[PDB]
Design a protein around this ligand. Structure first.
Ligand code: 3PE
Ligand code: CHD
Ligand code: MYR
Lengths: 459, 156, 88, 173, 171, 547, 128, 120
C-alpha cells in the first residue's frame, strides 16, 4: 500500500517546488495519474482479502472507497481554482497541501490493518477538514457550533478510545485479521451495554444520525466547494467502514441495541425528505438530502444481513458520486449569482442548455433511477428489511416517494421556469464547469455495466 | 454587508419596537403583526395573508410576474409553499363542506354496496364445467402415488 | 400551423369593420381617429360592447384597465398592433 | 461455452413435427428461410471460419485450479490462526461453491418450465421435487448465520441442529 | 379602491362570458345577451348612489350560484391553452453580449445598429435621471406613471427592456 | 428458430440505433426527424416477420442473452420474453407509433427543439417494448420507470407552462406511488420465493399470494390511472397533443393492466384481488364516464373518454379473462390515438382553440377530419364488427354470464351507455351545427403528410381489429351460449346511449334559460376528488413539514 | 338560498362579496394611496438599477435576505421551560418514534417464536 | 336474474347452492347412467399444449380446429367449418350444464312437499 502513499506525498514538493503558473496543472496531471494505479487494488480473491503487511491491507469492501477518494482529489482541485484565482500564491499551496494530506490520511484509513491505527487516522482526518472549512469558509456569522464537535469527542471519540484499549487487554489484540478468529461471544451485561455504546456512538455522529445531524446542514452552509465534496463523498463514509468492521465483535448484543438506532433512521428518512421540500437553499437542501440516504445505510449495517452489506456499499458510493456532483452542479450557479438561495435564480435552462442536461442527468440518478447503482444498492436494502420486518416497506416507500418529490422539485424550481429578468451575468457554461460534471455522471453509470466491483465483500 | 438591526430578531412586546418591524419590511403599522409570543420563536416577522400567488393579479407588470412578487415586498413565512406550483388557495367553485362531503357520498356509498353484492352476487343457474380424470387431479400434478377419490360425473 | 401572418394594413379594417356592423353609428361619419364619446356621440357602456367584439373578432382577452382608454380606433389598432408586436 | 456437458443440464428431446401442408397456396416462410442459409447463416459462418482458421494456427490453453482438501474446523484449535485460517478459507470456498448449486439447479427449473410450457405441472416432478432437496440441505447448512459467516458459526449451527434432533429421536423410544 | 361605478363593469363583461358559454348557440347567445342587458337597463338609469351602492351586493351574491362549472377562458390569456406555452422559447435580449465572435460574424449588420441603440441607452441615461426630478413629489412618487421626453432626440426614461422585449413568437 | 429469435431482437436494438446517432457525430442535420420514422417503418416490417412465425408456430421464446449479476443464489440478465404478448402487442404499438410518427413531423414544425422532441419520443418507445418483453421483475421494473421518466419530460415539454410543471409532477407523484406495490412484490417473491424470473414464480404456484398480488393491484392503481390514483391521466392534456396521443392513450396507460395479465397463472386462484380489481374498475369505469358526461375540454374529455375504457379493462381482468382483456388494449388504442390526432386537426384549423363549445360547422368545412371521427366513435361506442365492438360484446359475456358481484354489474352497463353519450356530445359540437369558431378562418388541412398519418391510422380500426381476431390461436373456452338478452344487452343498451344523449343534446337548442344543478357540477368538477385531494394533501405534506 | 361560502384556509373569499371593499372611505383611501406610493418608490428605486446599463450582477434584494435569514432560526428566540410548545412540540418528534418501537419489535418477537416452532413459512426463503 | 331473484327472494332452500352444486347423491333415483367417454387420452391432451380450462370432454373436438389452422398458414379462412364442430359440441355442454343443474333443483323442490306432509 506504499506504492500509493509516497506518490501522494510526492505531490507536496510538486505543489511547492513547481513554477508559479503550473501549480494547478502539475498536481492535476499526476493526481489523475495516481488514480489510474489505484485501479490495481481490484485484485481481490474469493476466500481471502489482500494482506500486504502489518500496517495496511485492503479487502473487497475497502477498495471501492479507496478508488473514490483517489478519484476524487483531482475533481476537487478542478472546481477549486475558480474561487482561488484571486488568492495569493503562497496560500493556494497551503490549501492544496491540506487536500494531499487529507487524501493521505483517508487512503491510509480505509487500508489500516490495526483498529487503533484506524482510530488514530480517523481523528487526524478531521484536522484538515476543519482548516479547509474554517480557514476558507463562506460565512462570517459565528454560529458557535463548537459544542457539537465537543459533543462529538464527549459522546464519540473519547469513549471509543477506552473501549478499543479495553478490548486489546481482554482479547489480546486489535488486528482485524486476529479479531476474525479471536472474536468472543459478548454476553449481556451493563458493562458491555456501556462498551457497545463506545464502539458505535463515535461513528453514528459522522454518518450522521437523525437528531445528531445538526452540524451537517451548518457544515456545508459554510464549507467551500472544495471542502464540501470530501465531507459528503468520503468523510461521511468513515463511520460505515468502522461500523461494518467493528460490528464483528458486538454480537449478539447488537440484536436488541440496534432498535433505537433503527427507529431513528426508519423515521428519520421521511423527516429529512419533507423538510428539503421546505428548504430555501441549494446546498442545505442537499445537506438533509445527504442525511436521507445515509439513514438507509445505518439500518443495513445494524441488521447485518448478507444483502444489507452488499447494498450498503453502493449507497455510499452512489451517494458520494451523487451529492459530490450535486454540490459542484449547485456551485456552478454560485459562480454566477454568488448565492445559495434557490429562488433567487430560475429558468436557467433558458440560458445554460448543457448545464440543465447535467441537472436532469444528476437528479435522475439521485432518486435511484433504474438500473443505476443508486437503485441497485437502495433496492438491495429494501428487500433485506422485509425478512427482518415486513412493515418497513411503508417507510421505505414513503421515503422513496418524497425523495422523488423534492429531487425533481429542485430541478423544476431552477431550470424549468422563467428567467429572472434583472439577472444580467448568466455567461455561457465554461469548459471547466461542464468537464467537472461529466467526470462525475459518466463513471457513475459505467459501474452499472459491471456491478461486481462495488458489491461489497459478501459477493 | 447588511446591517444587524435590519434583520429578523426577537418578538417585539411593545408598539414602539413594533414600529421598526412594520417599517422594516415596508408594511404599514396597521397591516403588521407577528406571531404570538411563545416557544414558536418565529421572530419579528409579520403575519401575511394565507393566500397563494395565483390570487394576485398577473395583469400588473411586476418585476417578477412569474412569482407575482414585486421587489421590496415582504414574503409569507411559507410563500415558497404558496407559489404558483405549490398549494393554491384561490376561490373555490362549490361549497367547502359539501365539496368535501360530495366526495364522501359517492365513495362511501360504493364500498359498502360491494359488500352487499358480495353476499348475493350475480351468476347463471348452471352446473360445474365437468372434467374427466378424477377432476383433473393428475393434470394439476396430483401425486401419482396416492390416487385421488374416484370422480365420475354421470350423463343426464 | 403554416403561417398566420398579421399586417397593420390588413388589420386596419378588421378593427374598423367591427364598427361597420354597429347599429348605433353612421358608417360614413366614422373616421380612423374619431373619438367615440364626442365624435361618435357614444358612451362608456356602449364602448364596452365594441371592446368585447374585438375579442371574438381576433381571439385574445383585453384587460379591464386598458380597455376603457381605447376611445380611438388608432389606439385600438395600437393595442392590437403593439400587443402582438405587429409593425408593418 | 466451448463444450458444456449435457448430463448436468438435462434436456428432453425436441420433436419438431414434419409439416403436412394441405392448403392450396404457397408457404410464405420458405422464401425467407432459404435466404437465411445464403444471406444470413453462411455469411455469419463465412466470416467465422476466416476468424476460426487463425485460432487453429495459434494455440494456447488454460487449466481449472484444483484445491486439495485441508483439515476442517473440527481439526482446528481455539485461538489458532494457522489451522483456523486453512479451514476458514476452505469453508468459505466450499460454501461459495455450494452457492452456485442452487443457481445451477434453478437453471434446470427454468428449463422444465419454458421448453415444456403448458405441460409444466406434470412434466417437472423430478425437477420440482429435486429442487426441494437442494433447498433443504443448503438452507440448513448456511442460513440464519448473519452477515459475518464463519466456520465456527456454521459448526455451531450444525452442532445446534444435530443436538436438537438428538433428543427428539430418542424421545420416540 | 377603483370606485363602485367601475365595479359595475367588472361584472357586466364577466357575467356575459359565463352566460356566453351557457348560451353556446349563436341565436341563443344574442337573445339571452339581450335578456341580460335588458335587466341592466332596468337599473341603468338608477342614479341613486345609496341604491346603486346597494344595487350591486345581490348581483355578486346572485352570480355565484350561476357561475359556469367549466367557464371558458381565452387561449393566450392566463389559464388558457396557450398560457405562456412559448415562454420556454423566448430569450432575453441582454444575453446578446455573451455571443461568441464567430457566432456574431453571421449577423454583422444587425449588431452594428444595436451599438447605437445602446448608445442612446447610455448617453440619454444621465438627463433621464433629472427628467423625473421635476415630476418627483416628496414623500416618494405618488404613482408609477411616467412622462414622455419633452425634447427632441431623447426618449421617456425607463424604457430599455420593454422596447427591446422579445417578440411573441420566437419561432 | 434461429431466424425467428434473431430477427426478433433486431427491433429493440434497431430502434436504438438512431438514438446512438444523436449523442455522436454531426454528419447530417435537418434529416433526423424522418430518420426515426423510417426506422419504425423498417422496424414494423421486422415486427411483422415474427408475427408470421409466431402464429404458425406459437413459439414463445425466453432468451437469456447475458449474465449480468449474481448474488449467492440469484442471477440477473438483460433477457427478453418473446411470447404471445410481445409478438402481438409490439406490432400494434409500432403501427400506432408509425401513424403518430408522421403526425408529429408536421404538428411540431413550430418547435426549434423538434429534433430534441424525437430524441425522447424514440426513447419512450424503447422502454415500453423492453417492459413488455421483460422476463424478470427487475428488468420489468426498469421499463416501469422509463415510462415514468420519459413521460416526465414529454409531459412537460413546454417547461414554462405552470400547468406542465404542476401536472408533470402530479403524475410523477402518482406514478411513483404505484411502484410501492411493485417493489413490495419483488420483496415477497424474494423472501417467500427466491427469484425474480417468471419461470420460477409461475411454476412454484404460490399457495398464499395475497400480498404479492396486492402490490400488483396498487401498481395499476396509479400507473394506469385507476380511481384512487386517477386524476393525473387527464392532467397530461396540458401539453403537446402528439405527446398525449402515444404515451397516455396507447402505450404508457396500458402498463397497469399488463402486469396482472403477465401474472395470469397466479391471479386466477386468489379471488381477493379479483373483487377489489373488479370493484376498482367498477368505481373508476363509471366515475370516469360519470365525470365525463359534462366535461367541457376537448383534450381532457378524450382523456376521460380514454379513462373509462381503461377503467373497464380492470373489470375485464377482474372477471378472470386473461387473453380476452388483452384484445381491448390493442383495439382501443387505434382510434383513440387517432382521435387525439383528429383532435389535432381540429386544433390546427382552430389556431389554438380547444373549448368544445367553440367548435362546429365542420362536416364540410373539415371533410377529412369528419371522415375518421365517426369510425373511432362508432368503434368506441361498440359498432358491430368494428375494432371496439369485438371486445365490448365479448368482454360483457363472462361478466354478465359468470359469477360476479351484484353491484359490479350495476355500474358495468350504466357507464357503458355513457360511453356513447359524450361521443354524441362531441361529434355534435365537433361536427354538427353551424360554425362557432372565431371570425377569421384558418381552416386548412390539405397537408399530404398528415393525410398519410390519418390514412395509416384510419385503416387499422376498420380492418386491423377484424384481422387480428382471426390469426390468434385458441386459449379459452368462449361462452358462446347465454341468454339472448345478455348476449345482446350490449346490442340493446348501445343504441340507448346515442339516443339518450341525443335526447339530452337537442333539447338544449331551444331558447330557454339554464338552471344550475349540483350533480351537473359534481360530475363536471371531476367529483371534487382532484379539486380537493390536490390542495390539502400537498398542504398536509408541506405545511406540516417544518414542524 | 345561495348559502354564502364558508371562508376557509384553503378557499379565499371572492373579491366582490367582502363588505370591506364596497365602501371606500378615507379609512381606506388613505391606506390605499400610501401603499402605492411606497410601492412606487420601491419600483422607482429598483427602476434605476434595472434600466441602468452599468450594472453587471444580481440585485441584492433586502426583502429576500430577511426572508431567508428568518428561516434559519436556531437559538435566538424561544425559552427552554415554555410548557405551551416544548412538551407538546417535543412530542411531535419523539412521540411516534416509540410507537414504531413496539410495531416492529412485536412482530419480530412474534416472528421468532413461530420459527422456533415452525409456525411460519420459509421453505423457499434464502435472501435474508 | 330470475334464478338469482327466485332463490333468495323466494325460498332459499329450494335452489341448490351454485358453489356447492352438486350436493345430492348421483344415484338419487337415477339408474343406469352411461359413462362419458374421452376420445383423447392423457397423452394427447399433454402433447396438445392446451390450457387445462381449455381441456374438457368437448376438447377432443377442439384438437381438430387447430390441426387445419397450422397448415392453413398464411391464410386463416380455411378451418372455419371445423370450429363449429367443437363450438356446437361446446354448445351441447352448456345445455348439459343447464340440465345438470335442474336435477339438483328438482330434488330440493320435490323434497319440500314430501317433508311438508311428513310433519303437517
Ligand atoms: C461513566 C462510567 C462508564 C462505565 C464504565 C464501566 O463501568 O466499565 C466497567 C468495566 C470494568 O470491568 P473490567 O475489569 O474492565 O472487565 C470485566 C467486565 N465485566 O469496564 C469494562 O470492562 C469495559 C469498559 C469499556 C469502556 C467503557 C466506555 C465508557 C463510556 C460508556 C458509555 C458510552 C455512552 C455514549 C453516549 C450515548 C449517548 C446516547
Ligand atoms: C454513411 C451515410 C453517409 C452518407 C453521406 O456521405 O452523406 C450515413 C451518414 C447520414 C445517414 C443518413 C441520414 O441519417 C438520413 C438518411 C435518409 C433517411 O432518414 C433514412 C436514413 C438515411 C439513409 C441515413 C442512412 C446512413 O446512416 C447515413 C446515410
Ligand atoms: C337478472 O340478471 C336478469 C333480470 C331479468 C330476469 C328475468 C325475469 C323474467 C323472465 C324469467 C323467465 C324467463 C327466463 C329468462
Amino acid at each position: 500500500m506504499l506504492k500509493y502513499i509516497i506518490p501522494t506525498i510526492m505531490l507536496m514538493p510538486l505543489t511547492w517546488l513547481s513554477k508559479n503558473n503550473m501549480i494547478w496543472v502539475n498536481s492535476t496531471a499526476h493526481s489523475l495519474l495516481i488514480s489510474f494505479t489505484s485501479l490495481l487494488l481490484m485484485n481481490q480473491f474469493g476466500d481471502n482479502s489482500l494482506n500486504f503487511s502489518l500496517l495496511f491491507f485492503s479487502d473487497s469492501l475497502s477498495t471501492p472507497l479507496l478508488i473514490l477518494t483517489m478519484w476524487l482529489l483531482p475533481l476537487m482541485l478542478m472546481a477549486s481554482q475558480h474561487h482561488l484565482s484571486k488568492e495569493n500564491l503562497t496560500r493556494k499551496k497551503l490549501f492544496i497541501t491540506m487536500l494531499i494530506s487529507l487524501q493521505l490520511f483517508l487512503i491510509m484509513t480505509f487500508t489500516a490493518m490495526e483498529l487503533i491505527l484506524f482510530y488514530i487516522l480517523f481523528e487526524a482526518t478531521l484536522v484538515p477538514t476543519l482548516i479547509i472549512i474554517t480557514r476558507w469558509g463562506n460565512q462570517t456569522e459565528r454560529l458557535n457550533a463548537g459544542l457539537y464537535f465537543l459533543f462529538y469527542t464527549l459522546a464519540g471519540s473519547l469513549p471509543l478510545l477506552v473501549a478499543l484499549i479495553y478490548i486489546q487487554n481482554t482479547v489480546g489484540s486489535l488486528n482485524f485479521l486476529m479479531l476474525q478468529y479471536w472474536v468472543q461471544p459478548v454476553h449481556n451485561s451493563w458493562s458491555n451495554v456501556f462498551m457497545w455504546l463506545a464502539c458505535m456512538m463515535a461513528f453514528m455522529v459522522k454518518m450522521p444520525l437523525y437528531g445528531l445531524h445538526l452540524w451537517l446542514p451548518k457544515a456545508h452552509v459554510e464549507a467551500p466547494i472544495a471542502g464540501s465534496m470530501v465531507l459528503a463523498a468520503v468523510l461521511l463514509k468513515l463511520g460505515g467502514y468502522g461500523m461494518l468492521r467493528i460490528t464483528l465483535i458486538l454480537n449478539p448484543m447488537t440484536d436488541f441495541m440496534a432498535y433505537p438506532f433503527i427507529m431513528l433512521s426508519l423515521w428519520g428518512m421521511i423527516m429529512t425528505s419533507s423538510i428539503c421540500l421546505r428548504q430555501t437553499d441549494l446546498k442545505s437542501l442537499i445537506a438533509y438530502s445527504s442525511v436521507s440516504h445515509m439513514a438507509l445505510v445505518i439500518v443495513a449495517i445494524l441488521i447485518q444481513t448478507p444483502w444489507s452489506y452488499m447494498g450498503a456499499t453502493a449507497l455510499m458510493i452512489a451517494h458520494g458520486l451523487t451529492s459530490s456532483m450535486l454540490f459542484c452542479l449547485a456551485n456552478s450557479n454560485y459562480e454566477r449569482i454568488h448565492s445559495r438561495t434557490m429562488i433567487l435564480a430560475r429558468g436557467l435552462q433558458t440560458l445554460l442548455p448543457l448545464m440543465a442536461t447535467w441537472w436532469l442527468l444528476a437528479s435522475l440518478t439521485n432518486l435511484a433511477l433504474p438500473p443505476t447503482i443508486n437503485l441497485i444498492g437502495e433496492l438491495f436494502v429494501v428487500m433485506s428489511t422485509f425478512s427482518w420486518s415486513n412493515i418497513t416497506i411503508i417507510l421505505m416507500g414513503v421515503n422513496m416517494v418524497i425523495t422523488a418529490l423534492y429531487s425533481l422539485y429542485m430541478l423544476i424550481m431552477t431550470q424549468r421556469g422563467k428567467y429572472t429578468y434583472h439577472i444580467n451575468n448568466i455567461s455561457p457554461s465554461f469548459t471547466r464547469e461542464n468537464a467537472l460534471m461529466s467526470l462525475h455522471i459518466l463513471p457513475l453509470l459505467l459501474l452499472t455495466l459491471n456491478p461486481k466491483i462495488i458489491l461489497g465483500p459478501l459477493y | 454587508h447588511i446591517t444587524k438591526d435590519m434583520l429578523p430578531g426577537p418578538y417585539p412586546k411593545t408598539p414602539e419596537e413594533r414600529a421598526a418591524a412594520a417599517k422594516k419590511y415596508n408594511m404599514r403599522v396597521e397591516d403588521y403583526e407577528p406571531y404570538p409570543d411563545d416557544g414558536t420563536g418565529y421572530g419579528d416577522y409579520p403575519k401575511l395573508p394565507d393566500r397563494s400567488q395565483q390570487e394576485r393579479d398577473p395583469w400588473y407588470d411586476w418585476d417578477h410576474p412569474d412569482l407575482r412578487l414585486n421587489w421590496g415586498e415582504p414574503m409569507h413565512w411559507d410563500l415558497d409553499m404558496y407559489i404558483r406550483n405549490r398549494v393554491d388557495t384561490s376561490p373555490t367553485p362549490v361549497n367547502w363542506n359539501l365539496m368535501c362531503k360530495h366526495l364522501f357520498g359517492f365513495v362511501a356509498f360504493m364500498l359498502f354496496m360491494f359488500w352487499v353484492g358480495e353476499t348475493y352476487p350475480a351468476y347463471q343457474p348452471v352446473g360445474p364445467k365437468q372434467y374427466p380424470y378424477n377432476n383433473l387431479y393428475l393434470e394439476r400434478g396430483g401425486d401419482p402415488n396416492k390416487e385421488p377419490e374416484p370422480v365420475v360425473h354421470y350423463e343426464i | 400551423s403554416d403561417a398566420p401572418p398579421l399586417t397593420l394594413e390588413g388589420i386596419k379594417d378588421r378593427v374598423l369593420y367591427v364598427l361597420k356592423l354597429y347599429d348605433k353609428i353612421d358608417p360614413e361619419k366614422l373616421s380612423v381617429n374619431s373619438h367615440f364619446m364626442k365624435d361618435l356621440g357614444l358612451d362608456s357602456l356602449d364602448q364596452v360592447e365594441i371592446i368585447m367584439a374585438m375579442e371574438d373578432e381576433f381571439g385574445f382577452e383585453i384587460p379591464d384597465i386598458d380597455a376603457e382608454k381605447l376611445m380611438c380606433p388608432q389606439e385600438i389598432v395600437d393595442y392590437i398592433a403593439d400587443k402582438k408586436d405587429v409593425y408593418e | 461455452p466451448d463444450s458444456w456437458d449435457k448430463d448436468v443440464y438435462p434436456e428432453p428431446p425436441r420433436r419438431t413435427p414434419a409439416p403436412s401442408p394441405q392448403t392450396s397456396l404457397p408457404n410464405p416462410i420458405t422464401y425467407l428461410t432459404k435466404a437465411f442459409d445464403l444471406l444470413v447463416d453462411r455469411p455469419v459462418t463465412l466470416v467465422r471460419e476466416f476468424i476460426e482458421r487463425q485460432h487453429a494456427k495459434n494455440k494456447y490453453y488454460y487449466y481449472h485450479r484444483e484445491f486439495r482438501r485441508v483439515p476442517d474446523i473440527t481439526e482446528c484449535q481455539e485461538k489458532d490462526v494457522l489451522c483456523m485460517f486453512e479451514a476458514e478459507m476452505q469453508w468459505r470456498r466450499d460454501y461459495k461453491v455450494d452457492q452456485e448449486i442452487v443457481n445451477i439447479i434453478q437453471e434446470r427449473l427454468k428449463a422444465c418450465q419454458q421448453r415444456e410450457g403448458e405441460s409444466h405441472r406434470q412434466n417437472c416432478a423430478k425437477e420440482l421435487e429435486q429442487f426441494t432437496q437442494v433447498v433443504k440441505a443448503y438452507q440448513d447448512r448456511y442460513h440464519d448465520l448473519g452477515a459475518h459467516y464463519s466456520a465456527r458459526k456454521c459448526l455451531a449451527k450444525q452442532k445446534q441442529r444435530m443436538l436438537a434432533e438428538r433428543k427428539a429421536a430418542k424421545e420416540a423410544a | 379602491y377603483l370606485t363602485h361605478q367601475q365595479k359595475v363593469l367588472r361584472l357586466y363583461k364577466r357575467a356575459l362570458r359565463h352566460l356566453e358559454s351557457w348560451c353556446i348557440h349563436r341565436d341563443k347567445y344574442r337573445y339571452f345577451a339581450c335578456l341580460l342587458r335588458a335587466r341592466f337597463d332596468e337599473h341603468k338609469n338608477e342614479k341613486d348612489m345609496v341604491k346603486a351602492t346597494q344595487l350591486l351586493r345581490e348581483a355578486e351574491e346572485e352570480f355565484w350560484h350561476g357561475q359556469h362549472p367549466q367557464p371558458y377562458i381565452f387561449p393566450e390569456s392566463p389559464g388558457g391553452t396557450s398560457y405562456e406555452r412559448y415562454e420556454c422559447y423566448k430569450v432575453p435580449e441582454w444575453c446578446l453580449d455573451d455571443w461568441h465572435p464567430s457566432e456574431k460574424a453571421m449577423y454583422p449588420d444587425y449588431f452594428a445598429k444595436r451599438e447605437q441603440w445602446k448608445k442612446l441607452r447610455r448617453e440619454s441615461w444621465e438627463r433621464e435621471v433629472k427628467q423625473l426630478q421635476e415630476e418627483t413629489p416628496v414623500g416618494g412618487p405618488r404613482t408609477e406613471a411616467l412622462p414622455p421626453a419633452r425634447k427632441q432626440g431623447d426618449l421617456p426614461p425607463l424604457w430599455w427592456h420593454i422596447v427591446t422585449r422579445p417578440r411573441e413568437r420566437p419561432m | 428458430m434461429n431466424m425467428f429469435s434473431s430477427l426478433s431482437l433486431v427491433t429493440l436494438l434497431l430502434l436504438t440505433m438512431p438514438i446512438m446517432m444523436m449523442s455522436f457525430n454531426t454528419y447530417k442535420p435537418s434529416n433526423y426527424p424522418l430518420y426515426v420514422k423510417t426506422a419504425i417503418s423498417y422496424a414494423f416490417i421486422t415486427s411483422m416477420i415474427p408475427t408470421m412465425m409466431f402464429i404458425h408456430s406459437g413459439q414463445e421464446l425466453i432468451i437469456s442473452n447475458w449474465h449480468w449479476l449474481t448474488i449467492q443464489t440469484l442471477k440477473l440478465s438483460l433477457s427478453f420474453k418473446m411470447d404471445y404478448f410481445s409478438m402481438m402487442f409490439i406490432p400494434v404499438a409500432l403501427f400506432v407509433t408509425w401513424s403518430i410518427m408522421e403526425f408529429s413531423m408536421w404538428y411540431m414544425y413550430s418547435d426549434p427543439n423538434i429534433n430534441k422532441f424525437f430524441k425522447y419520443l424514440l426513447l419512450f418507445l424503447i422502454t415500453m417494448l423492453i417492459l413488455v418483453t421483460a422476463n424478470n421483475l427487475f428488468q420489468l421494473f426498469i421499463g416501469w420507470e422509463g415510462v415514468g421518466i420519459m413521460s416526465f419530460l414529454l409531459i412537460g415539454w413546454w417547461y414554462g407552462r405552470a400547468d406542465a410543471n404542476t401536472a408533470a409532477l402530479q403524475a410523477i407523484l402518482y406514478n411513483r406511488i404505484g411502484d410501492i406495490g411493485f417493489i413490495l412484490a419483488m420483496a415477497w417473491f424474494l423472501t417467500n420465493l427466491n427469484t425474480w424470473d417468471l419461470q420460477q414464480i409461475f411454476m412454484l404456484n404460490p399457495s398464499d399470494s395475497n400480498m404479492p398480488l396486492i402490490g400488483l393491484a396498487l401498481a395499476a392503481t396509479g400507473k394506469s390511472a385507476q380511481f384512487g390514483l386517477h386524476p393525473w391521466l387527464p392532467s397530461a392534456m396540458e401539453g403537446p397533443t402528439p405527446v398525449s396521443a402515444l404515451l397516455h392513450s396507447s402505450t404508457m396507460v396500458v402498463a397497469g393492466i399488463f402486469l396482472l395479465i403477465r401474472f395470469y397463472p397466479l391471479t386466477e386462484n386468489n379471488k381477493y384481488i379479483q373483487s377489489i380489481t373488479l370493484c376498482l374498475g367498477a368505481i373508476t369505469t363509471l366515475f370516469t364516464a360519470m365525470c365525463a358526461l359534462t366535461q367541457n375540454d376537448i383534450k381532457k374529455i378524450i382523456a376521460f373518454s380514454t379513462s373509462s375504457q381503461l377503467g373497464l379493462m380492470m373489470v375485464t381482468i377482474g372477471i378472470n379473462q386473461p387473453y380476452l382483456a388483452f384484445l381491448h388494449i390493442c383495439t382501443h388504442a387505434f382510434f383513440k390515438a387517432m382521435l387525439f390526432m383528429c383532435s389535432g386537426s381540429i386544433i390546427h384549423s382552430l389556431n389554438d382553440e380547444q373549448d368544445i363549445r367553440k367548435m362546429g360547422g365542420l362536416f364540410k368545412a373539415m371533410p377529412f377530419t369528419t371522415t375518421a371521427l365517426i369510425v373511432g366513435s362508432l368503434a368506441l361506442t361498440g359498432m358491430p364488427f368494428l375494432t371496439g365492438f369485438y371486445s365490448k360484446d365479448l368482454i360483457i359475456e363472462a361478466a354478465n354470464t359468470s359469477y360476479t358481484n351484484a353491484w359490479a354489474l350495476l355500474m358495468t352497463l350504466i357507464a357503458t351507455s355513457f360511453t356513447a353519450i359524450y361521443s354524441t356530445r362531441i361529434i355534435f359540437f365537433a361536427l354538427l351545427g353551424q360554425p362557432r369558431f372565431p371570425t377569421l378562418v384558418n381552416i386548412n388541412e390539405n397537408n399530404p403528410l398528415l393525410i398519410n398519418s390519418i390514412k395509416r391510422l384510419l385503416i387499422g380500426s376498420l380492418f386491423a381489429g377484424y384481422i387480428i381476431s382471426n390469426n390468434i390461436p385458441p386459449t379459452t373456452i368462449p361462452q358462446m351460449t347465454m341468454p339472448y338478452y345478455l348476449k345482446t344487452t350490449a346490442l340493446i343498451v348501445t343504441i340507448l346511449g346515442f339516443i339518450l344523449a341525443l335526447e339530452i343534446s337537442n333539447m338544449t337548442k331551444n331558447l330557454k334559460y339554464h338552471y344550475p344543478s349540483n350533480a351537473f357540477k359534481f360530475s363536471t368538477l371531476l367529483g371534487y376528488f382532484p379539486t380537493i385531494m390536490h390542495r390539502l394533501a400537498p398542504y398536509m405534506n408541506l405545511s406540516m413539514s417544518q414542524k | 338560498s345561495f348559502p354564502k361560502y364558508e371562508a376557509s384556509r384553503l378557499s379565499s373569499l371572492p373579491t366582490t362579496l367582502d363588505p370591506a371593499e364596497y365602501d371606500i372611505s378615507s379609512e381606506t383611501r388613505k391606506a390605499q394611496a400610501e401603499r402605492l406610493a411606497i410601492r412606487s418608490r420601491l419600483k422607482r428605486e429598483y427602476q434605476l438599477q434595472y434600466y441602468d446599463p452599468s450594472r453587471r450582477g444580481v440585485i441584492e434584494d433586502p426583502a429576500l435576505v430577511r426572508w431567508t435569514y428568518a428561516r434559519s432560526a436556531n437559538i435566538y428566540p424561544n425559552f427552554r421551560p415554555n410548557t405551551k410548545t416544548s412538551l407538546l412540540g417535543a412530542l411531535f418528534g419523539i412521540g411516534p418514534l416509540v410507537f414504531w418501537y413496539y410495531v416492529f419489535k412485536t412482530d419480530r418477537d412474534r416472528k421468532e417464536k413461530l420459527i422456533q416452532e415452525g409456525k411460519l413459512d420459509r421453505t423457499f426463503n434464502i435472501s435474508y | 336474474g330470475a334464478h338469482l331473484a327466485r332463490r333468495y327472494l323466494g325460498d332459499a332452500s329450494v335452489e341448490p347452492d351454485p358453489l356447492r352444486m352438486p350436493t345430492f347423491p348421483p344415484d338419487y333415483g337415477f339408474p343406469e347412467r352411461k359413462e362419458r367417454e374421452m376420445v383423447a387420452t392423457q397423452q394427447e391432451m399433454n402433447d396438445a399444449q392446451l390450457v387445462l380450462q381449455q381441456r374438457d370432454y368437448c376438447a377432443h373436438y377442439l384438437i381438430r380446429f387447430l390441426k387445419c389452422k397450422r397448415d392453413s398458414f398464411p391464410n386463416f379462412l380455411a378451418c372455419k367449418h371445423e370450429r363449429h364442430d367443437w363450438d356446437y359440441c361446446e354448445h351441447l355442454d352448456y345445455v348439459k350444464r343447464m340440465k345438470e343443474f335442474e336435477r339438483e333443483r328438482r330434488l330440493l323442490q320435490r323434497k319440500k312437499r314430501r317433508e311438508q306432509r311428513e310433519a303437517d
